[PDB]
Amino acid sequence: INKEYRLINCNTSAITQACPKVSFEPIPIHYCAPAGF
Amino acid sequence: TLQCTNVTRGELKNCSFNMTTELRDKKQKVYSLFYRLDVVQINKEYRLINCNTSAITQACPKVSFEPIPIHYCAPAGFAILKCKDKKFNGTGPCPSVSTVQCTHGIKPVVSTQLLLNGSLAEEEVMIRSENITNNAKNILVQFNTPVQINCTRPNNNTRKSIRIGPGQAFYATGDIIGDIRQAHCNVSKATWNETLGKVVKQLRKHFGNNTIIRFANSSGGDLEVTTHSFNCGGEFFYCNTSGLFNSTWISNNDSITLPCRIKQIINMWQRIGQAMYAPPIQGVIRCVSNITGLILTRDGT
Amino acid sequence: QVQLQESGPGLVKPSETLSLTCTVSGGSISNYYWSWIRQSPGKGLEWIGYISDSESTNYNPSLKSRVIISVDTSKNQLSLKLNSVTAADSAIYYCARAQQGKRIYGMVSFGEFFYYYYMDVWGKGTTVTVSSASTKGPSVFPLAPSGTAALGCLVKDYFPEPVTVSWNSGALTSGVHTFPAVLQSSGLYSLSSVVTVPSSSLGTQTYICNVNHKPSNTKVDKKVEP
Amino acid sequence: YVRPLSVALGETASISCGRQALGSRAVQWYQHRPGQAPILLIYNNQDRPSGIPERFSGTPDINFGTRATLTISGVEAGDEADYYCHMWDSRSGFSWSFGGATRLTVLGQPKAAPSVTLFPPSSEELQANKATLVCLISDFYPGAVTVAWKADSSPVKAGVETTTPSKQSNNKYAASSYLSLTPMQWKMHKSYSCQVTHEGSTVEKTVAPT
Ligand SMILES: *[C@@H]1O[C@H](CO)[C@@H](O[C@@H]2O[C@H](CO)[C@@H](O[C@@H]3O[C@H](CO[C@H]4O[C@H](CO[C@H]5O[C@H](CO)[C@@H](O)[C@H](O)[C@@H]5O[C@H]5O[C@H](CO)[C@@H](O)[C@H](O)[C@@H]5O)[C@@H](O)[C@H](O[C@H]5O[C@H](CO)[C@@H](O)[C@H](O)[C@@H]5O)[C@@H]4O)[C@@H](O)[C@H](O[C@H]4O[C@H](CO)[C@@H](O)[C@H](O)[C@@H]4O[C@H]4O[C@H](CO)[C@@H](O)[C@H](O)[C@@H]4O[C@H]4O[C@H](CO)[C@@H](O)[C@H](O)[C@@H]4O)[C@@H]3O)[C@H](O)[C@H]2NC(C)=O)[C@H](O)[C@H]1NC(C)=O
Ligand SMILES: *[C@@H]1O[C@H](CO)[C@@H](O[C@@H]2O[C@H](CO)[C@@H](O[C@@H]3O[C@H](CO[C@H]4O[C@H](CO)[C@@H](O)[C@H](O)[C@@H]4O)[C@@H](O)[C@H](O[C@H]4O[C@H](CO)[C@@H](O)[C@H](O)[C@@H]4O)[C@@H]3O)[C@H](O)[C@H]2NC(C)=O)[C@H](O)[C@H]1NC(C)=O
Ligand SMILES: *[C@@H]1O[C@H](CO)[C@@H](O[C@@H]2O[C@H](CO)[C@@H](O[C@@H]3O[C@H](CO[C@H]4O[C@H](CO)[C@@H](O)[C@H](O)[C@@H]4O)[C@@H](O)[C@H](O)[C@@H]3O)[C@H](O)[C@H]2NC(C)=O)[C@H](O)[C@H]1NC(C)=O
Ligand SMILES: *[C@@H]1O[C@H](CO)[C@@H](O[C@@H]2O[C@H](CO)[C@@H](O)[C@H](O)[C@H]2NC(C)=O)[C@H](O)[C@H]1NC(C)=O
Ligand SMILES: *[C@@H]1O[C@H](CO)[C@@H](O[C@@H]2O[C@H](CO)[C@@H](O)[C@H](O)[C@H]2NC(C)=O)[C@H](O)[C@H]1NC(C)=O
Ligand SMILES: *[C@@H]1O[C@H](CO)[C@@H](O[C@@H]2O[C@H](CO)[C@@H](O)[C@H](O)[C@H]2NC(C)=O)[C@H](O)[C@H]1NC(C)=O
Ligand SMILES: *[C@@H]1O[C@H](CO)[C@@H](O[C@@H]2O[C@H](CO)[C@@H](O)[C@H](O)[C@H]2NC(C)=O)[C@H](O)[C@H]1NC(C)=O
Ligand SMILES: *[C@@H]1O[C@H](CO)[C@@H](O[C@@H]2O[C@H](CO)[C@@H](O)[C@H](O)[C@H]2NC(C)=O)[C@H](O)[C@H]1NC(C)=O
Ligand SMILES: *[C@@H]1O[C@H](CO)[C@@H](O[C@@H]2O[C@H](CO)[C@@H](O)[C@H](O)[C@H]2NC(C)=O)[C@H](O)[C@H]1NC(C)=O
Ligand SMILES: *[C@@H]1O[C@H](CO)[C@@H](O[C@@H]2O[C@H](CO)[C@@H](O)[C@H](O)[C@H]2NC(C)=O)[C@H](O)[C@H]1NC(C)=O
Ligand SMILES: *[C@@H]1O[C@H](CO)[C@@H](O)[C@H](O)[C@H]1NC(C)=O
Ligand SMILES: *[C@@H]1O[C@H](CO)[C@@H](O)[C@H](O)[C@H]1NC(C)=O
Ligand SMILES: *[C@@H]1O[C@H](CO)[C@@H](O)[C@H](O)[C@H]1NC(C)=O
Numbered sequence A: 001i002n003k004e005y006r007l008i009n010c011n012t013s014a015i016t017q018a019c020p021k022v023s024f025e026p027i028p029i030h031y032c033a034p035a036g037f
Numbered sequence B: 001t002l003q004c005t006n007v008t009r010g011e012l013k014n015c016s017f018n019m020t021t022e023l024r025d026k027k028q029k030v031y032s033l034f035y036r037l038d039v040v041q042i043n044k045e046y047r048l049i050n051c052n053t054s055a056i057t058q059a060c061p062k063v064s065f066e067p068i069p070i071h072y073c074a075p076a077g078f079a080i081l082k083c084k085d086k087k088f089n090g091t092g093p094c095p096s097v098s099t100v101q102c103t104h105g106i107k108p109v110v111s112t113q114l115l116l117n118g119s120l121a122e123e124e125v126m127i128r129s130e131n132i133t134n135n136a137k138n139i140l141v142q143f144n145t146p147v148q149i150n151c152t153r154p155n156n157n158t159r160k161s162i163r164i165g166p167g168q169a170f171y172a173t174g175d176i177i178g179d180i181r182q183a184h185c186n187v188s189k190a191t192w193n194e195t196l197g198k199v200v201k202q203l204r205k206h207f208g209n210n211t212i213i214r215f216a217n218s219s220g221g222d223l224e225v226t227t228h229s230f231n232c233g234g235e236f237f238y239c240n241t242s243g244l245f246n247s248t249w250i251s252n253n254d255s256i257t258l259p260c261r262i263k264q265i266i267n268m269w270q271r272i273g274q275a276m277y278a279p280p281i282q283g284v285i286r287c288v289s290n291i292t293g294l295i296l297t298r299d300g301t
Numbered sequence C: 001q002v003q004l005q006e007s008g009p010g011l012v013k014p015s016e017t018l019s020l021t022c023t024v025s026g027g028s029i030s031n032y033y034w035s036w037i038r039q040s041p042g043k044g045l046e047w048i049g050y051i052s053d054s055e056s057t058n059y060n061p062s063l064k065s066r067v068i069i070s071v072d073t074s075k076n077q078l079s080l081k082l083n084s085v086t087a088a089d090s091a092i093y094y095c096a097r098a099q100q101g102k103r104i105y106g107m108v109s110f111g112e113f114f115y116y117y118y119m120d121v122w123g124k125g126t127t128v129t130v131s132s133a134s135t136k137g138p139s140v141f142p143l144a145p146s147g148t149a150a151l152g153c154l155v156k157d158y159f160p161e162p163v164t165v166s167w168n169s170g171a172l173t174s175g176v177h178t179f180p181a182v183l184q185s186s187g188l189y190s191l192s193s194v195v196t197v198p199s200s201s202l203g204t205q206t207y208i209c210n211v212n213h214k215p216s217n218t219k220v221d222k223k224v225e226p
Numbered sequence D: 001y002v003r004p005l006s007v008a009l010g011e012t013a014s015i016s017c018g019r020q021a022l023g024s025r026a027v028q029w030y031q032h033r034p035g036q037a038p039i040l041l042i043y044n045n046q047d048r049p050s051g052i053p054e055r056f057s058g059t060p061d062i063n064f065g066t067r068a069t070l071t072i073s074g075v076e077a078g079d080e081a082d083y084y085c086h087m088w089d090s091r092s093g094f095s096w097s098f099g100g101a102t103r104l105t106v107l108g109q110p111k112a113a114p115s116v117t118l119f120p121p122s123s124e125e126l127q128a129n130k131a132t133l134v135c136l137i138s139d140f141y142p143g144a145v146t147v148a149w150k151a152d153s154s155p156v157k158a159g160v161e162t163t164t165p166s167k168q169s170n171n172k173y174a175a176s177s178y179l180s181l182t183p184m185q186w187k188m189h190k191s192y193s194c195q196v197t198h199e200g201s202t203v204e205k206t207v208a209p210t
Helices: B189-202
Strands: B002-006 B013-020 B028-034 B044-045 B055-058 B082-083 B097-100 B126-128 B139-157 B161-166 B168-173 B184-187 B213-215 B226-230 B233-239 B247-249 B254-265 B272-279 B283-296 C003-009 C021-025 C032-038 C047-053 C057-059 C077-079 C091-104 C114-123 C126-130 C140-143 C148-156 C164-167 C176-178 C188-200 C206-211 C217-224 D002-008 D011-014 D023-030 D039-042 D056-058 D069-073 D082-089 D100-106 D117-119 D131-140 D144-153 D159-160 D173-176 D177-181 D193-199 D201-203
Touching: B002 D201, B013 D131, B044 C140, B139 B226, B161 C176, B184 B189, B184 D100, B189 B247, B189 B283, B189 C047, B213 C032, B226 B283, B226 D002, B283 C148, C003 C091, C003 C114, C021 C091, C032 C114, C047 C091, C047 D131, C091 D023, C091 D144, C114 D023, C114 D039, C114 D082, C140 C206, C140 C217, C148 C206, C148 D117, C148 D131, C176 C217, C188 D131, D011 D100, D039 D056, D131 D144, D144 D159
Parallel strands: B028 B168, B055 B272, D002 D100
Antiparallel strands: B002 B013, B002 B044, B013 B028, B082 B097, B126 B139, B139 B184, B139 B283, B161 B168, B184 B254, B213 B247, B226 B233, B233 B254, C003 C021, C021 C077, C032 C047, C032 C091, C047 C057, C091 C114, C091 C126, C140 C148, C148 C188, C164 C206, C176 C188, C206 C217, D011 D069, D023 D039, D023 D082, D056 D069, D082 D100, D117 D131, D131 D173, D131 D177, D144 D193, D159 D177, D193 D201
8 A cells, every 4th residue: 555455456357256166167058059050 | 424515505515524445444434426306404414415314325426417319119029119190199999000020219307297219299299198087197198390409517526436345446536627507408498388388278178278288396295396397418417497377378599497406315216225326427518409299287277 | 087185194103093085076976976985004905895886885804893994076176084093004005096897797687796806096194103102293404505506405304204395486397306304313304305406597597496395284394504 | 025036237127926816806006116106007807097008918818727927028227126916706705905015126127326415514403502414315326225324533423323225206215314512622633524335435524614
């Protein structure tokens, strides 16, 4: 602004803590086209 | 709790208040301008008008309150039927009919007393109601020639962003740059005289060629109905209409001025428990629109 | 056209009523706004108050509690009665005709204008001094001369300002040179006038300086000769 | 209080108003030479009265934002006075006070030297048991002089009064100077002088009792 600090996002945006059950693991995704395509 | 003062008659205020910052443990004493219709008392102490009734949501300052032509379409297997009768009143058998898939360009104009930017009537001016003898039925008269109205809030307002939280910004009225004037509207006293004369001509066809037709102002209600309530450039006007409906007609440059007030805390409809703060508009607001219809209410000489 | 001339005591004791008058010439008194303005030494032009063509009172709130501007239409004369005077009230008081301007910026119907007043013609001024000291007339002492020559008159101890000096009752006006006063440590001003004069006419033409000091009602003259 | 401003002879003067307006304004400009009647220069933001040179011009408010300034082109030496800005506008109430006295001083004026004239005590006041030397100084510029009295060759410094340099109608300055003496002090001396140092040079004028 002991020394005084602050979260980097406070002057720009709100912050949402990621749910600690979901995983950031790349799971193989398959993109499929609908019927007729 | 707001600490408000008059601004250097006595309509728009200048209020200051302790406000939360972007840090949850820091306050700030910021100030802002509010119209009279948005505040009530308890330096004098004030408060937003909605606080004892409802929560308030500030409208996103990127969306526009501009009536865009909307087309209503029927799904496949259905159809819409138009009416090509240039003198078609509300009900009855339309002689000339045609089918369409979508309606024409309909501008969702939220108005009051005066139908703004609407579609005209071909041939002569029409007048409609369910039972014109029933005085509790609003008469929906639609002009054939538009009488032009010019409205403006001439105050050069300024918008002030106020960080009220992480990513939360309250847009406030900073201060007025220059003159402080009155918001009003103009109609041509000539084009409004002949338009009232055409309306008064069709009013005798079911009321009597000898009885007198008189025009008066509203007799009570809320601000949204007792005044010409509409939107102009993004701010909600409320225009006194006593200068338009003050004429008594017998069996046989000009300019009218309507003193409009401006409000920011508005319940759009009759919504209970919901309020909206319209953010202030920078610059000098002026909008040019046609009044093409009218919503009357006879008394019941 | 229109010209004004003030007049008054010139000296008023502290804690009293400072009377003042101003007669206008060449115009009707009851169709113009009139304003009083004073200018103290060191301070700026201070607006006392003003009276309308409808004879309405409105004073500067800095004073007000001491001002009462009157007006008699039998003559072209209006007054000004500042009372409870103190030391800071010493100033040159001016008599100016204020004209009304209606500055319209929006709609005249809603009242979107404001009135501004401007003074165009002014009075010459009247010096007012506040002091418990009594008045005192001066005493003219002649200054004798000796191509070109110069002679004048010494106007010793007097109080208060001002004194008017005329030469030959008003005939001698070219080459005249009256100097500003000098406040002595005793508390009295000493002024001196002087007239530059061609040398040949020193022994022929006669010169008489006419000194007047209004707070003492004194009119005195004197001759100058080598 | 006073705001200093300096322009050169024959240039353009830009007297900015002290209080800038909040809304639509009606500014009156006044010229005031101290010890004299104020002179109205411009009453409506741009309108001047009858008898004001064209070189005086005030800025009108056609668009808001443009501040009111007094413009004096080709400034003369006589345009040395206090200039007030009487500011009315729609937002402020009733402006009772005038502006802040801008004291415009013109630079580059002709440097003129004084004119000393020393008179001896008159016979009447000498017969009244009081002597008075008067040393009249006039027509000097810049208006600031230092006076030195001398009994014979010795400095006096005791019992002398001197005017502050007041301005003349010819835009030059003048100041008196009186030395009070006893009728015997003035008789017991051979001569009396009035050294008048203006700028960087002195001017002597001596007077003896004969
Ligand atoms: C909806 O409907 C509404 C209502 O129906 C409608 O409202 C209207 O809004 C407009 C805009 O908002 C308003 O227009 C304003 O009008 C003001 C008043 O104008 C009138 O009065 C002045 C002054 O009159 C005095 O002086 C003249 C001589 O100059 C005399 O002849 C008069 O008789 C009168 O003098 C007597 O009366 C005095 C009392 O007032 C006494 O005190 C006095 O002793 C005398 O007895 C006139 O000049 C005007 O004349 C003009 O109008 C005629 C038609 O009538 C035109 O043909 C012609 O163009 C004339 O010029 C008029 O009669 C104006 O002051 C105002 O304009 C000024 O203000 C704005 C903002 O402040 C400035 O930006 C602008 O530039 C103007 O400033 C100039 O003037 C001021 C004041 O003098 C100066 O200080 C300033 O420096 C500047 O001077 C510059 O311009 C001058 C020329 O203008 C020039 O001479 C200078 O040299 C310099 O360059 C503005 O125009 C209108 O009033 C509303 N209507 C009503 C009824 O109130 C609305 O528009 C409608 N539409 C919507 C909302 O969309
Ligand atoms: C709505 O209400 C708010 C109040 O909550 C108003 O905001 C205040 O407005 C006033 C003016 O009306 C402001 O006062 C001005 O402050 C200026 C800032 O100067 C400060 O900082 C300097 C350091 O640089 C200090 O030295 C100084 O002392 C101040 O603390 C000043 O420049 C102004 O001075 C002017 O006035 C004085 C005396 O009147 C003159 O002598 C000066 O020459 C000069 O002309 C003045 O003091 C105040 O700061 C505002 N407050 C905030 C929090 O912003 C809104 O204006 C008002 N809006 C409307 C539309 O009514
Ligand atoms: C009834 O209909 C009228 C027209 O159909 C409406 O008038 C419109 O009002 C809106 C808002 O008040 C205006 O939008 C504003 O536009 C200006 C700039 O516009 C100017 O510049 C553009 C350049 O891109 C140019 O194309 C335009 O022609 C203008 O010259 C912006 O500054 C504003 O932020 C805002 O976007 C419309 O411009 C205006 N249209 C017309 C034709 O005047 C009126 O509001 C309607 N009334 C009601 C009650 O709904
Ligand atoms: C929020 O604060 C950050 C502080 O890091 C600002 O980012 C810095 O801004 C300064 C000057 O504005 C720059 O010199 C730095 O280079 C910036 N650093 C980074 C990492 O961006 C940021 O601008 C602020 N945001 C807002 C909206 O005020
Ligand atoms: C703003 O100005 C109005 C107009 O003068 C004030 O209204 C007055 O309010 C007091 C109560 O405090 C009443 O006694 C008066 O009768 C009211 N006068 C009028 C003409 O309505 C109002 O109080 C002012 N508000 C502020 C905050 O100064
Ligand atoms: C919230 O407060 C407002 C204050 O304006 C209340 O509305 C006023 O209520 C009083 C008495 O109840 C009436 O005399 C006024 O005519 C009302 N004014 C308006 C504009 O409605 C409102 O009733 C309060 N609401 C609740 C739920 O308490
Ligand atoms: C207000 O007035 C008329 C409608 O009565 C519109 O102007 C006319 O619009 C039609 C079709 O849009 C054109 O054929 C005419 O040539 C127009 N006339 C003129 C003189 O321009 C105008 O667009 C209407 N404004 C609205 C509905 O917002
Ligand atoms: C309304 O006021 C704003 C200022 O609050 C004006 O914006 C200025 O416009 C000029 C151009 O004429 C720019 O040079 C300035 O930098 C602008 N100022 C700001 C703060 O942006 C605007 O012109 C005014 N509009 C009207 C109609 O009065
Ligand atoms: C409403 O505003 C419009 C435009 O601002 C006015 O139409 C103008 O009228 C003048 C005078 O007849 C013409 O010189 C202009 O060319 C018109 N503008 C356009 C775009 O055509 C109209 O008169 C105003 N009406 C009222 C009642 O105020
Ligand atoms: C709309 O305007 C009319 C006048 O144009 C206002 O009528 C005033 O009504 C009050 C009673 O409430 C009277 O005391 C006034 O004398 C009326 N004024 C005039 C000029 O007739 C009317 O009040 C306005 N509407 C609102 C809601 O204020
Ligand atoms: C803000 O809080 C302080 C705390 O004492 C109080 O004195 C002040 O009046 C408050 N300001 C406002 C505008 O409520
Ligand atoms: C519309 O016209 C029909 C026949 O012309 C008539 O029966 C009907 O009553 C009219 N509508 C109204 C509201 O009068
Ligand atoms: C209607 O007009 C009457 C008289 O003209 C007035 O007393 C009343 O306040 C007006 N009401 C509205 C809502 O304009």
